[PDB]
Design a protein around this ligand. Structure first.
Ligand SMILES: *CCC(=O)Nc1ccc(-c2ccc3[nH]ncc3c2)cc1
Length: 240
């Protein structure tokens, strides 16, 4: 049993792996009821006070000489990747409920000038007490969700997250990524050669969802909708 401030965990209770990182299940040393995820980063913020129902809370952190430990809110429902694998696709009404929650979380991050950069289904966690609550984490390996300007090592901004959300919502609607690639290098070459991109949207898609997806899935960030346009898009206020 190891401890970080008022929290404890065993390396036997592995939740997942990230970039040179591992995540263990742990708990409050006093309140064994309060479960946490402990992220151990190998070296090889505002986040602590940043607080939203759709953001995984940071309860504590601890830099050591070669290691960094984050004590995070425990989410019991797995990730969007698992949900999408089970359901294959989601209804527009479920997509809209998911997107309202992501948009709220992203608005707070945009407010504080924070850009996620690696939004993907494995970083969008579900919490069951739809009533499904989504929580964004890490504010791996799959490059399908990275904005073109990111995978081509350019000067990107907040708009990179809008590309990622576009690719996630497209996969929610259709069951597939909009620009599928055997490999990163292929995806990087596809975006290099294709200065224009039109994703194929099923004709049955509602006009507001089609309009939103075309506005997010713009190859060039100058043409991509900005955060305020996304947050207030008519799709997010349309009736079920
Ligand atoms: C980069 C994506 C990935 O597959 N790794 C990963 C693993 C585990 C978490 C995580 C974070 C916070 C949390 N709270 N309860 C459960 C978890 C899991 C995130 C990303």
């Amino acid at each position: 049993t190891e401890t970080v401030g008022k929290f404890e965990f065993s390396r036997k209770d592995l939740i997942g792996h990230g970039a040179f990182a591992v995540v263990f299940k742990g708990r409050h040393r006093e309140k064994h009821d309060l479960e946490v995820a402990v992220k151990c980063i190998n070296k090889k913020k505002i986040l602590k006070e940043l607080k939203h129902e759709n953001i995984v809370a940071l309860y504590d952190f601890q830099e050591m000489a070669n290691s960094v430990y984050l004590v995070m809110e425990y989410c019991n429902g797995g990730d969007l990747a698992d949900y999408l694998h089970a359901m294959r696709t989601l209804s527009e009404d479920t997509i809209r409920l998911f997107l309202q929650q992501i948009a709220g979380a992203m608005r707070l991050l945009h407010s504080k000038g924070i850009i996620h950069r690696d939004l993907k289904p494995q970083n969008i966690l579900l919490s069951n007490p739809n009533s499904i609550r989504v929580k964004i984490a890490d504010f791996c390996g799959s490059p399908m969700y990275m904005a073109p300007e990111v995978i081509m090592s350019q000067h990107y901004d907040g708009k990179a997250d809008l590309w990622s959300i576009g690719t996630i919502v497209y996969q929610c609607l259709t069951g597939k990524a909009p620009f599928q690639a055997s490999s990163p290098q292929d995806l990087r070459l596809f975006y290099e050669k294709n200065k224009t991109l039109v994703p194929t949207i099923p004709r049955e898609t509602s006009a507001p969802l089609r309009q939103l997806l075309l506005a997010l899935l713009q190859r060039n960030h100058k043409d991509r909708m900005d955060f305020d346009e996304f947050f207030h898009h008519p799709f997010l206020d349309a009736s079920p």
